[PDB]
RNA sequence: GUAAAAAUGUUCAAAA
RNA sequence: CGCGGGGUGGAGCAGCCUGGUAGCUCGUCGGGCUCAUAACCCGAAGGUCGUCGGUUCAAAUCCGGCCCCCGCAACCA
RNA sequence: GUGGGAGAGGGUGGUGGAAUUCCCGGAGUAGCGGUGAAAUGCGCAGAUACCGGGAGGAACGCCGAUGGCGAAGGCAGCCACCUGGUCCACCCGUGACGCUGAGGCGCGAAAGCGUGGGGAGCAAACCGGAUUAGAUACCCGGGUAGUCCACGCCCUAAACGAUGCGCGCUAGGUCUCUGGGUCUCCUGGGGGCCGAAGCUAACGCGUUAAGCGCGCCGCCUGGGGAGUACGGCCGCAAGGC
């Protein structure tokens, strides 16, 4: 805002895995202030992880998120005339926030039925480096460079 | 910094033939330099240029060559 | 049809009861300035009486604004009760009523 | 059709575009490039990034004929001139020398209007 | 020394 | 009527100059997104290549029947 | 009168390099150009970029400036010739010969006009492209008079310091150009800022006055109509008084 740099709210570490990064994800999964059904589903998914994935449903989460992080994004910018969308670097915590969001959306966008199964599958794929929210990241990066010329427009 | 007027003794500023004598007033590209860097007065800087030009006509003093390294 | 002037450059308000254009004609104030008119035209909210007429002196004509929004609704002949225009999108009278 | 060690490279950068042409010990072209040559077009040519790729693709081709030590002469005030010099140095070519020889009338023929504006 | 691009409509008094 | 140059995404339309490559703008669809609009930006449906046939692991390419539109010397009792 | 000073003062002739365009030659290839973004435009019939050679015209970069000169308009590379005004020093000459100035005469930016010449760049008009509701404009691509020279007209202007010229008197401080000299400063001419007293409607002016006085010319007397109409004069005309 106009005054200060807002306030970087802090997270209350997971209550089953404990971590301020596994919690936020549960915020997005959450709808209508239902922290309840939120977390719940997140683990019901971790379960499905084990099922076939004999891997830790904790790193399969850390990895996924990692593969879906926008190194650089393209943000608009009205110039002395028409508007140009400049390519810039994404804040570290900005990369996270987004990396997560898309995951959630990319999850519901799947043809699955149990929200757990979805948030489950997606995370697998996202970790494999080839999912739905992944395309988004591979893509949002494509935007940059494409408009690499307008580099001299960094604000 | 080093004032051009300084670095030299008693010279005839109306000597359109003394290469170096005059050759040392032409910036780094031939530009006949200002008092702010030569240090002559009104009546001087004048009679100076007049003569500096004369020398340019005789292939002695250059007209411009754009300094090297940019 | 048209005007009927002699030495005067503006049409006078014909006061009522002659104006058989609409029903119930009912007189009213002098609120809304003239186009530099020296004042304020003659109004006759009138049939309904949720309807207003102010007079066009140059024009010869009285023009209807709604009782509610205050939006120009037409121009009509005092003679007949046949309108003369379209509704002008661009003026409002309720700032004067 | 020849292959010379030492050569020369010219930089021309008008606010609309930047062109680089590599010559020889005399000034006779070996190859060139610029904004459009790369893949850009229009306004996105006066852009520095553009200039960059250019100077690169320029010398990049010069490599074929085997170019190494080559002076540099710059002409322009291009909103993308430096990148030219930079991209050059940072190439398989050694910037043997950098000079600025942008033409300039010693007050001669009247200019257009977009320029005559100075009076 | 250089913001592309955007027209136009309304009409009085209160103080001593 | 005879030589002999090509058909391709709906359209504009490159390779055939020495045989594995399904090229791109505009246009169509969503988006990015702007003041509207527009250049631009990214993904994308959009070409058995007319086809009976020879050639090959693979054929639009080496090439035969002419099927058709353009070019078409000239001729025309 | 004498001896010296500075200056883009004016006229004639001559001369230099930078750069633009066009031509010629070489090298080289897929775009250049341009804008807010584009398009028209130019380019495979080889353009843009580079190198070399040639022609031609116009203007004079750095010096250069709150700078100088001239009555104003106005004046700028360098060189020579012809020529004007002006400042200081010397107190040598003449001895009021001075100031102003209706009318008259000369000069007078740019544009414009005539005859002839010249024509690179720029550019009214004009043609295109975009923008826009339109765009007879702004922006872009082209482009002719004209700009340039000689001779002759034209005679206007925010021709502005919006301040007529001349002489005397009324604190200085500061910086700048140019002189003379018993060179931390004195002294004369000129260009700026801040400012005594004072004037002023205020804004501001102030030894360069809009201060304080005298001599002479010019002009004003409510806004619009109107710098129009008529008459007169001048002009090739446009027009001017
Ligand atoms: Mg000088
Ligand atoms: Mg009115
Ligand atoms: Mg451009
Ligand atoms: Mg613009
Ligand atoms: Mg409009
Ligand atoms: Mg109107
Ligand atoms: Mg209207
Ligand atoms: Mg009004
Ligand atoms: Mg009382
Ligand atoms: Mg002189
Ligand atoms: Mg002459
Ligand atoms: Mg001359
Ligand atoms: Mg030349
Ligand atoms: Mg021409
Ligand atoms: Mg040629
Ligand atoms: Mg063409
Ligand atoms: Mg061809
Ligand atoms: Mg060819
Ligand atoms: Mg050269
Ligand atoms: Mg040349
Ligand atoms: Mg004067
Ligand atoms: Mg002047
Ligand atoms: Mg003289
Ligand atoms: Mg003299
Ligand atoms: Mg004395
Ligand atoms: Mg005497
Ligand atoms: Mg005496
Ligand atoms: Mg005496
Ligand atoms: Mg005597
Ligand atoms: Mg006597
Ligand atoms: Mg005597
Ligand atoms: Mg005369
Ligand atoms: Mg004149
Ligand atoms: Mg003229
Ligand atoms: Mg003439
Ligand atoms: Mg004639
Ligand atoms: Mg002529
Ligand atoms: Mg011509
Ligand atoms: Mg001709
Ligand atoms: Mg032009
Ligand atoms: Mg426009
Ligand atoms: Mg418009
Ligand atoms: Mg408009
Ligand atoms: Mg407009
Ligand atoms: Mg133009
Ligand atoms: Mg033009
Ligand atoms: Mg004409
Ligand atoms: Mg004419
Ligand atoms: Mg003429
Ligand atoms: Mg007059
Ligand atoms: Mg007078
Ligand atoms: Mg002295
Ligand atoms: Mg003085
Ligand atoms: Mg003084
Ligand atoms: Mg006082
Ligand atoms: Mg006072
Ligand atoms: Mg003052
Ligand atoms: Mg004084
Ligand atoms: Mg003074
Ligand atoms: Mg003064
Ligand atoms: Mg008079
Ligand atoms: Mg009057
Ligand atoms: Mg009157
Ligand atoms: Mg007049
Ligand atoms: Mg008359
Ligand atoms: Mg006559
Ligand atoms: Mg005529
Ligand atoms: Mg007349």
mmCIF file with all atom_site columns, C-alpha atoms (C1' of nucleotides) in Angstrom, chain G residues 5-175:
data_model
loop_
_atom_site.group_PDB
_atom_site.id
_atom_site.type_symbol
_atom_site.label_atom_id
_atom_site.label_alt_id
_atom_site.label_comp_id
_atom_site.label_asym_id
_atom_site.label_entity_id
_atom_site.label_seq_id
_atom_site.pdbx_PDB_ins_code
_atom_site.Cartn_x
_atom_site.Cartn_y
_atom_site.Cartn_z
_atom_site.occupancy
_atom_site.B_iso_or_equiv
_atom_site.pdbx_formal_charge
_atom_site.auth_seq_id
_atom_site.auth_comp_id
_atom_site.auth_asym_id
_atom_site.auth_atom_id
_atom_site.pdbx_PDB_model_num
ATOM 1   C "C1'" . G G 1 5   ? 42.380  49.960  -29.511 1.00 0.00 ? 5   G G "C1'" 1
ATOM 2   C "C1'" . A G 1 6   ? 38.272  46.238  -30.012 1.00 0.00 ? 6   A G "C1'" 1
ATOM 3   C "C1'" . G G 1 7   ? 34.552  44.399  -32.944 1.00 0.00 ? 7   G G "C1'" 1
ATOM 4   C "C1'" . A G 1 8   ? 29.850  38.630  -36.547 1.00 0.00 ? 8   A G "C1'" 1
ATOM 5   C "C1'" . G G 1 9   ? 29.593  46.939  -38.967 1.00 0.00 ? 9   G G "C1'" 1
ATOM 6   C "C1'" . G G 1 10  ? 28.993  47.057  -44.558 1.00 0.00 ? 10  G G "C1'" 1
ATOM 7   C "C1'" . G G 1 11  ? 30.442  45.854  -49.965 1.00 0.00 ? 11  G G "C1'" 1
ATOM 8   C "C1'" . U G 1 12  ? 33.651  43.073  -53.846 1.00 0.00 ? 12  U G "C1'" 1
ATOM 9   C "C1'" . G G 1 13  ? 36.774  38.909  -54.925 1.00 0.00 ? 13  G G "C1'" 1
ATOM 10  C "C1'" . G G 1 14  ? 38.802  34.179  -53.367 1.00 0.00 ? 14  G G "C1'" 1
ATOM 11  C "C1'" . U G 1 15  ? 39.248  29.784  -50.440 1.00 0.00 ? 15  U G "C1'" 1
ATOM 12  C "C1'" . G G 1 16  ? 38.555  25.133  -46.457 1.00 0.00 ? 16  G G "C1'" 1
ATOM 13  C "C1'" . G G 1 17  ? 36.776  21.033  -44.255 1.00 0.00 ? 17  G G "C1'" 1
ATOM 14  C "C1'" . A G 1 18  ? 32.454  18.343  -41.961 1.00 0.00 ? 18  A G "C1'" 1
ATOM 15  C "C1'" . A G 1 19  ? 27.808  16.570  -43.745 1.00 0.00 ? 19  A G "C1'" 1
ATOM 16  C "C1'" . U G 1 20  ? 23.315  15.504  -47.046 1.00 0.00 ? 20  U G "C1'" 1
ATOM 17  C "C1'" . U G 1 21  ? 21.659  13.808  -52.037 1.00 0.00 ? 21  U G "C1'" 1
ATOM 18  C "C1'" . C G 1 22  ? 22.666  12.010  -56.925 1.00 0.00 ? 22  C G "C1'" 1
ATOM 19  C "C1'" . C G 1 23  ? 26.167  9.228   -60.357 1.00 0.00 ? 23  C G "C1'" 1
ATOM 20  C "C1'" . C G 1 24  ? 30.306  5.634   -60.985 1.00 0.00 ? 24  C G "C1'" 1
ATOM 21  C "C1'" . G G 1 25  ? 33.269  1.354   -59.043 1.00 0.00 ? 25  G G "C1'" 1
ATOM 22  C "C1'" . G G 1 26  ? 34.151  -2.553  -55.421 1.00 0.00 ? 26  G G "C1'" 1
ATOM 23  C "C1'" . A G 1 27  ? 32.269  -5.936  -51.306 1.00 0.00 ? 27  A G "C1'" 1
ATOM 24  C "C1'" . G G 1 28  ? 28.128  -8.180  -49.520 1.00 0.00 ? 28  G G "C1'" 1
ATOM 25  C "C1'" . U G 1 29  ? 22.705  -10.200 -48.475 1.00 0.00 ? 29  U G "C1'" 1
ATOM 26  C "C1'" . A G 1 30  ? 17.035  -10.076 -46.608 1.00 0.00 ? 30  A G "C1'" 1
ATOM 27  C "C1'" . G G 1 31  ? 15.532  -6.585  -45.161 1.00 0.00 ? 31  G G "C1'" 1
ATOM 28  C "C1'" . C G 1 32  ? 15.625  -1.324  -44.581 1.00 0.00 ? 32  C G "C1'" 1
ATOM 29  C "C1'" . G G 1 33  ? 12.612  2.777   -43.235 1.00 0.00 ? 33  G G "C1'" 1
ATOM 30  C "C1'" . G G 1 34  ? 9.339   4.804   -39.835 1.00 0.00 ? 34  G G "C1'" 1
ATOM 31  C "C1'" . U G 1 35  ? 5.753   5.429   -35.329 1.00 0.00 ? 35  U G "C1'" 1
ATOM 32  C "C1'" . G G 1 36  ? 2.493   5.666   -29.677 1.00 0.00 ? 36  G G "C1'" 1
ATOM 33  C "C1'" . A G 1 37  ? 1.931   1.320   -32.369 1.00 0.00 ? 37  A G "C1'" 1
ATOM 34  C "C1'" . A G 1 38  ? 1.749   1.121   -37.827 1.00 0.00 ? 38  A G "C1'" 1
ATOM 35  C "C1'" . A G 1 39  ? 1.091   1.711   -42.783 1.00 0.00 ? 39  A G "C1'" 1
ATOM 36  C "C1'" . U G 1 40  ? 2.045   4.040   -47.411 1.00 0.00 ? 40  U G "C1'" 1
ATOM 37  C "C1'" . G G 1 41  ? 7.031   4.037   -48.965 1.00 0.00 ? 41  G G "C1'" 1
ATOM 38  C "C1'" . C G 1 42  ? 12.218  1.812   -50.776 1.00 0.00 ? 42  C G "C1'" 1
ATOM 39  C "C1'" . G G 1 43  ? 14.402  -3.340  -51.577 1.00 0.00 ? 43  G G "C1'" 1
ATOM 40  C "C1'" . C G 1 44  ? 16.332  -10.001 -54.814 1.00 0.00 ? 44  C G "C1'" 1
ATOM 41  C "C1'" . A G 1 45  ? 15.738  -5.521  -61.435 1.00 0.00 ? 45  A G "C1'" 1
ATOM 42  C "C1'" . G G 1 46  ? 20.402  -6.544  -55.099 1.00 0.00 ? 46  G G "C1'" 1
ATOM 43  C "C1'" . A G 1 47  ? 18.183  -1.637  -51.374 1.00 0.00 ? 47  A G "C1'" 1
ATOM 44  C "C1'" . U G 1 48  ? 19.918  -0.572  -45.800 1.00 0.00 ? 48  U G "C1'" 1
ATOM 45  C "C1'" . A G 1 49  ? 25.151  -1.013  -43.535 1.00 0.00 ? 49  A G "C1'" 1
ATOM 46  C "C1'" . C G 1 50  ? 30.796  -0.348  -45.224 1.00 0.00 ? 50  C G "C1'" 1
ATOM 47  C "C1'" . C G 1 51  ? 34.926  1.123   -48.544 1.00 0.00 ? 51  C G "C1'" 1
ATOM 48  C "C1'" . G G 1 52  ? 36.877  4.023   -52.714 1.00 0.00 ? 52  G G "C1'" 1
ATOM 49  C "C1'" . G G 1 53  ? 36.148  7.939   -56.708 1.00 0.00 ? 53  G G "C1'" 1
ATOM 50  C "C1'" . G G 1 54  ? 33.258  12.265  -58.819 1.00 0.00 ? 54  G G "C1'" 1
ATOM 51  C "C1'" . A G 1 55  ? 29.477  16.277  -59.293 1.00 0.00 ? 55  A G "C1'" 1
ATOM 52  C "C1'" . G G 1 56  ? 26.639  20.000  -57.074 1.00 0.00 ? 56  G G "C1'" 1
ATOM 53  C "C1'" . G G 1 57  ? 24.270  23.344  -53.725 1.00 0.00 ? 57  G G "C1'" 1
ATOM 54  C "C1'" . A G 1 58  ? 23.548  25.485  -49.140 1.00 0.00 ? 58  A G "C1'" 1
ATOM 55  C "C1'" . A G 1 59  ? 25.077  26.597  -44.102 1.00 0.00 ? 59  A G "C1'" 1
ATOM 56  C "C1'" . C G 1 60  ? 29.310  27.652  -41.420 1.00 0.00 ? 60  C G "C1'" 1
ATOM 57  C "C1'" . G G 1 61  ? 30.416  22.655  -35.735 1.00 0.00 ? 61  G G "C1'" 1
ATOM 58  C "C1'" . C G 1 62  ? 34.070  23.132  -31.262 1.00 0.00 ? 62  C G "C1'" 1
ATOM 59  C "C1'" . C G 1 63  ? 35.627  28.741  -30.256 1.00 0.00 ? 63  C G "C1'" 1
ATOM 60  C "C1'" . G G 1 64  ? 30.525  30.898  -28.538 1.00 0.00 ? 64  G G "C1'" 1
ATOM 61  C "C1'" . A G 1 65  ? 29.046  33.697  -24.089 1.00 0.00 ? 65  A G "C1'" 1
ATOM 62  C "C1'" . U G 1 66  ? 24.139  36.484  -18.810 1.00 0.00 ? 66  U G "C1'" 1
ATOM 63  C "C1'" . G G 1 67  ? 29.892  38.084  -25.328 1.00 0.00 ? 67  G G "C1'" 1
ATOM 64  C "C1'" . G G 1 68  ? 30.799  41.928  -29.239 1.00 0.00 ? 68  G G "C1'" 1
ATOM 65  C "C1'" . C G 1 69  ? 29.320  45.454  -33.362 1.00 0.00 ? 69  C G "C1'" 1
ATOM 66  C "C1'" . G G 1 70  ? 25.373  48.712  -35.903 1.00 0.00 ? 70  G G "C1'" 1
ATOM 67  C "C1'" . A G 1 71  ? 20.525  53.934  -36.180 1.00 0.00 ? 71  A G "C1'" 1
ATOM 68  C "C1'" . A G 1 72  ? 17.128  50.026  -36.923 1.00 0.00 ? 72  A G "C1'" 1
ATOM 69  C "C1'" . G G 1 73  ? 16.317  45.923  -39.901 1.00 0.00 ? 73  G G "C1'" 1
ATOM 70  C "C1'" . G G 1 74  ? 20.070  43.125  -38.944 1.00 0.00 ? 74  G G "C1'" 1
ATOM 71  C "C1'" . C G 1 75  ? 25.515  40.773  -38.839 1.00 0.00 ? 75  C G "C1'" 1
ATOM 72  C "C1'" . A G 1 76  ? 29.250  34.572  -37.559 1.00 0.00 ? 76  A G "C1'" 1
ATOM 73  C "C1'" . G G 1 77  ? 34.606  29.251  -41.237 1.00 0.00 ? 77  G G "C1'" 1
ATOM 74  C "C1'" . C G 1 78  ? 39.265  31.480  -43.317 1.00 0.00 ? 78  C G "C1'" 1
ATOM 75  C "C1'" . C G 1 79  ? 41.855  35.039  -46.481 1.00 0.00 ? 79  C G "C1'" 1
ATOM 76  C "C1'" . A G 1 80  ? 42.961  39.833  -49.086 1.00 0.00 ? 80  A G "C1'" 1
ATOM 77  C "C1'" . C G 1 81  ? 41.182  44.539  -50.935 1.00 0.00 ? 81  C G "C1'" 1
ATOM 78  C "C1'" . C G 1 82  ? 37.573  48.894  -50.636 1.00 0.00 ? 82  C G "C1'" 1
ATOM 79  C "C1'" . U G 1 83  ? 34.847  51.292  -46.570 1.00 0.00 ? 83  U G "C1'" 1
ATOM 80  C "C1'" . G G 1 84  ? 31.439  53.294  -42.067 1.00 0.00 ? 84  G G "C1'" 1
ATOM 81  C "C1'" . G G 1 85  ? 30.625  54.249  -37.143 1.00 0.00 ? 85  G G "C1'" 1
ATOM 82  C "C1'" . U G 1 86  ? 32.867  54.236  -32.414 1.00 0.00 ? 86  U G "C1'" 1
ATOM 83  C "C1'" . C G 1 87  ? 36.382  54.170  -27.488 1.00 0.00 ? 87  C G "C1'" 1
ATOM 84  C "C1'" . C G 1 88  ? 40.809  55.721  -24.728 1.00 0.00 ? 88  C G "C1'" 1
ATOM 85  C "C1'" . A G 1 89  ? 45.507  59.018  -24.237 1.00 0.00 ? 89  A G "C1'" 1
ATOM 86  C "C1'" . C G 1 90  ? 47.789  63.772  -25.458 1.00 0.00 ? 90  C G "C1'" 1
ATOM 87  C "C1'" . C G 1 91  ? 45.235  69.406  -24.033 1.00 0.00 ? 91  C G "C1'" 1
ATOM 88  C "C1'" . C G 1 92  ? 48.084  70.947  -29.452 1.00 0.00 ? 92  C G "C1'" 1
ATOM 89  C "C1'" . G G 1 93  ? 43.962  73.658  -33.330 1.00 0.00 ? 93  G G "C1'" 1
ATOM 90  C "C1'" . U G 1 94  ? 38.723  76.437  -34.291 1.00 0.00 ? 94  U G "C1'" 1
ATOM 91  C "C1'" . G G 1 95  ? 35.968  79.368  -31.023 1.00 0.00 ? 95  G G "C1'" 1
ATOM 92  C "C1'" . A G 1 96  ? 28.993  78.430  -29.740 1.00 0.00 ? 96  A G "C1'" 1
ATOM 93  C "C1'" . C G 1 97  ? 29.900  76.568  -35.686 1.00 0.00 ? 97  C G "C1'" 1
ATOM 94  C "C1'" . G G 1 98  ? 25.096  73.512  -30.814 1.00 0.00 ? 98  G G "C1'" 1
ATOM 95  C "C1'" . C G 1 99  ? 19.902  70.471  -29.796 1.00 0.00 ? 99  C G "C1'" 1
ATOM 96  C "C1'" . U G 1 100 ? 15.702  68.963  -32.426 1.00 0.00 ? 100 U G "C1'" 1
ATOM 97  C "C1'" . G G 1 101 ? 13.415  68.393  -36.620 1.00 0.00 ? 101 G G "C1'" 1
ATOM 98  C "C1'" . A G 1 102 ? 6.560   69.099  -40.237 1.00 0.00 ? 102 A G "C1'" 1
ATOM 99  C "C1'" . G G 1 103 ? 7.644   67.961  -45.218 1.00 0.00 ? 103 G G "C1'" 1
ATOM 100 C "C1'" . G G 1 104 ? 11.508  65.804  -48.382 1.00 0.00 ? 104 G G "C1'" 1
ATOM 101 C "C1'" . C G 1 105 ? 15.641  61.865  -49.232 1.00 0.00 ? 105 C G "C1'" 1
ATOM 102 C "C1'" . G G 1 106 ? 18.014  57.104  -48.041 1.00 0.00 ? 106 G G "C1'" 1
ATOM 103 C "C1'" . C G 1 107 ? 17.678  52.457  -45.395 1.00 0.00 ? 107 C G "C1'" 1
ATOM 104 C "C1'" . G G 1 108 ? 14.536  48.843  -43.959 1.00 0.00 ? 108 G G "C1'" 1
ATOM 105 C "C1'" . A G 1 109 ? 13.366  41.024  -41.392 1.00 0.00 ? 109 A G "C1'" 1
ATOM 106 C "C1'" . A G 1 110 ? 10.575  37.260  -43.557 1.00 0.00 ? 110 A G "C1'" 1
ATOM 107 C "C1'" . A G 1 111 ? 6.977   36.386  -47.067 1.00 0.00 ? 111 A G "C1'" 1
ATOM 108 C "C1'" . G G 1 112 ? 5.733   38.141  -51.950 1.00 0.00 ? 112 G G "C1'" 1
ATOM 109 C "C1'" . C G 1 113 ? 6.422   40.331  -57.419 1.00 0.00 ? 113 C G "C1'" 1
ATOM 110 C "C1'" . G G 1 114 ? 9.297   40.983  -62.355 1.00 0.00 ? 114 G G "C1'" 1
ATOM 111 C "C1'" . U G 1 115 ? 13.771  39.358  -65.922 1.00 0.00 ? 115 U G "C1'" 1
ATOM 112 C "C1'" . G G 1 116 ? 17.700  35.827  -66.123 1.00 0.00 ? 116 G G "C1'" 1
ATOM 113 C "C1'" . G G 1 117 ? 20.536  32.136  -63.623 1.00 0.00 ? 117 G G "C1'" 1
ATOM 114 C "C1'" . G G 1 118 ? 21.024  28.030  -59.719 1.00 0.00 ? 118 G G "C1'" 1
ATOM 115 C "C1'" . G G 1 119 ? 18.631  24.089  -57.199 1.00 0.00 ? 119 G G "C1'" 1
ATOM 116 C "C1'" . A G 1 120 ? 21.823  19.453  -52.527 1.00 0.00 ? 120 A G "C1'" 1
ATOM 117 C "C1'" . G G 1 121 ? 18.662  19.793  -48.170 1.00 0.00 ? 121 G G "C1'" 1
ATOM 118 C "C1'" . C G 1 122 ? 14.232  21.745  -46.483 1.00 0.00 ? 122 C G "C1'" 1
ATOM 119 C "C1'" . A G 1 123 ? 9.336   22.751  -47.791 1.00 0.00 ? 123 A G "C1'" 1
ATOM 120 C "C1'" . A G 1 124 ? 3.426   26.227  -48.283 1.00 0.00 ? 124 A G "C1'" 1
ATOM 121 C "C1'" . A G 1 125 ? 0.246   24.119  -52.296 1.00 0.00 ? 125 A G "C1'" 1
ATOM 122 C "C1'" . C G 1 126 ? -0.560  19.079  -53.736 1.00 0.00 ? 126 C G "C1'" 1
ATOM 123 C "C1'" . C G 1 127 ? -0.783  13.283  -53.563 1.00 0.00 ? 127 C G "C1'" 1
ATOM 124 C "C1'" . G G 1 128 ? -0.607  9.266   -50.422 1.00 0.00 ? 128 G G "C1'" 1
ATOM 125 C "C1'" . G G 1 129 ? -0.463  6.355   -44.858 1.00 0.00 ? 129 G G "C1'" 1
ATOM 126 C "C1'" . A G 1 130 ? -2.213  6.306   -40.304 1.00 0.00 ? 130 A G "C1'" 1
ATOM 127 C "C1'" . U G 1 131 ? -5.512  8.821   -36.046 1.00 0.00 ? 131 U G "C1'" 1
ATOM 128 C "C1'" . U G 1 132 ? -10.402 10.116  -35.653 1.00 0.00 ? 132 U G "C1'" 1
ATOM 129 C "C1'" . A G 1 133 ? -17.370 10.477  -35.763 1.00 0.00 ? 133 A G "C1'" 1
ATOM 130 C "C1'" . G G 1 134 ? -14.786 13.585  -39.540 1.00 0.00 ? 134 G G "C1'" 1
ATOM 131 C "C1'" . A G 1 135 ? -9.078  15.056  -39.683 1.00 0.00 ? 135 A G "C1'" 1
ATOM 132 C "C1'" . U G 1 136 ? -9.348  19.528  -45.927 1.00 0.00 ? 136 U G "C1'" 1
ATOM 133 C "C1'" . A G 1 137 ? -4.620  19.249  -39.225 1.00 0.00 ? 137 A G "C1'" 1
ATOM 134 C "C1'" . C G 1 138 ? -1.122  17.406  -35.384 1.00 0.00 ? 138 C G "C1'" 1
ATOM 135 C "C1'" . C G 1 139 ? 2.388   12.191  -36.771 1.00 0.00 ? 139 C G "C1'" 1
ATOM 136 C "C1'" . C G 1 140 ? 4.643   9.309   -41.231 1.00 0.00 ? 140 C G "C1'" 1
ATOM 137 C "C1'" . G G 1 141 ? 6.125   8.576   -46.690 1.00 0.00 ? 141 G G "C1'" 1
ATOM 138 C "C1'" . G G 1 142 ? 6.436   11.697  -51.138 1.00 0.00 ? 142 G G "C1'" 1
ATOM 139 C "C1'" . G G 1 143 ? 6.676   16.864  -53.017 1.00 0.00 ? 143 G G "C1'" 1
ATOM 140 C "C1'" . U G 1 144 ? 6.425   22.218  -56.388 1.00 0.00 ? 144 U G "C1'" 1
ATOM 141 C "C1'" . A G 1 145 ? 6.950   27.285  -55.985 1.00 0.00 ? 145 A G "C1'" 1
ATOM 142 C "C1'" . G G 1 146 ? 10.178  29.358  -52.579 1.00 0.00 ? 146 G G "C1'" 1
ATOM 143 C "C1'" . U G 1 147 ? 14.601  29.182  -49.834 1.00 0.00 ? 147 U G "C1'" 1
ATOM 144 C "C1'" . C G 1 148 ? 20.193  30.383  -52.767 1.00 0.00 ? 148 C G "C1'" 1
ATOM 145 C "C1'" . C G 1 149 ? 22.806  34.396  -56.455 1.00 0.00 ? 149 C G "C1'" 1
ATOM 146 C "C1'" . A G 1 150 ? 22.376  39.289  -59.913 1.00 0.00 ? 150 A G "C1'" 1
ATOM 147 C "C1'" . C G 1 151 ? 19.486  43.474  -61.222 1.00 0.00 ? 151 C G "C1'" 1
ATOM 148 C "C1'" . G G 1 152 ? 14.645  46.062  -60.247 1.00 0.00 ? 152 G G "C1'" 1
ATOM 149 C "C1'" . C G 1 153 ? 10.149  46.321  -57.190 1.00 0.00 ? 153 C G "C1'" 1
ATOM 150 C "C1'" . C G 1 154 ? 7.618   45.655  -52.617 1.00 0.00 ? 154 C G "C1'" 1
ATOM 151 C "C1'" . C G 1 155 ? 7.990   49.044  -47.556 1.00 0.00 ? 155 C G "C1'" 1
ATOM 152 C "C1'" . U G 1 156 ? 4.900   45.461  -43.645 1.00 0.00 ? 156 U G "C1'" 1
ATOM 153 C "C1'" . A G 1 157 ? 5.767   43.211  -38.430 1.00 0.00 ? 157 A G "C1'" 1
ATOM 154 C "C1'" . A G 1 158 ? 4.920   41.519  -31.078 1.00 0.00 ? 158 A G "C1'" 1
ATOM 155 C "C1'" . A G 1 159 ? 10.124  46.499  -37.035 1.00 0.00 ? 159 A G "C1'" 1
ATOM 156 C "C1'" . C G 1 160 ? 9.456   45.441  -28.745 1.00 0.00 ? 160 C G "C1'" 1
ATOM 157 C "C1'" . G G 1 161 ? 13.392  47.733  -24.151 1.00 0.00 ? 161 G G "C1'" 1
ATOM 158 C "C1'" . A G 1 162 ? 5.880   47.567  -26.518 1.00 0.00 ? 162 A G "C1'" 1
ATOM 159 C "C1'" . U G 1 163 ? 10.116  53.066  -23.238 1.00 0.00 ? 163 U G "C1'" 1
ATOM 160 C "C1'" . G G 1 164 ? 11.751  59.691  -29.413 1.00 0.00 ? 164 G G "C1'" 1
ATOM 161 C "C1'" . C G 1 165 ? 16.364  62.330  -29.394 1.00 0.00 ? 165 C G "C1'" 1
ATOM 162 C "C1'" . G G 1 166 ? 19.851  65.797  -26.846 1.00 0.00 ? 166 G G "C1'" 1
ATOM 163 C "C1'" . C G 1 167 ? 22.079  68.270  -22.327 1.00 0.00 ? 167 C G "C1'" 1
ATOM 164 C "C1'" . G G 1 168 ? 22.538  68.840  -16.674 1.00 0.00 ? 168 G G "C1'" 1
ATOM 165 C "C1'" . C G 1 169 ? 21.653  66.962  -11.634 1.00 0.00 ? 169 C G "C1'" 1
ATOM 166 C "C1'" . U G 1 170 ? 20.402  62.735  -7.712  1.00 0.00 ? 170 U G "C1'" 1
ATOM 167 C "C1'" . A G 1 171 ? 24.038  56.583  -2.789  1.00 0.00 ? 171 A G "C1'" 1
ATOM 168 C "C1'" . G G 1 172 ? 26.459  52.731  -3.790  1.00 0.00 ? 172 G G "C1'" 1
ATOM 169 C "C1'" . G G 1 173 ? 27.241  47.307  -4.003  1.00 0.00 ? 173 G G "C1'" 1
ATOM 170 C "C1'" . U G 1 174 ? 28.374  43.381  -7.345  1.00 0.00 ? 174 U G "C1'" 1
ATOM 171 C "C1'" . C G 1 175 ? 30.371  40.876  -12.792 1.00 0.00 ? 175 C G "C1'" 1
#
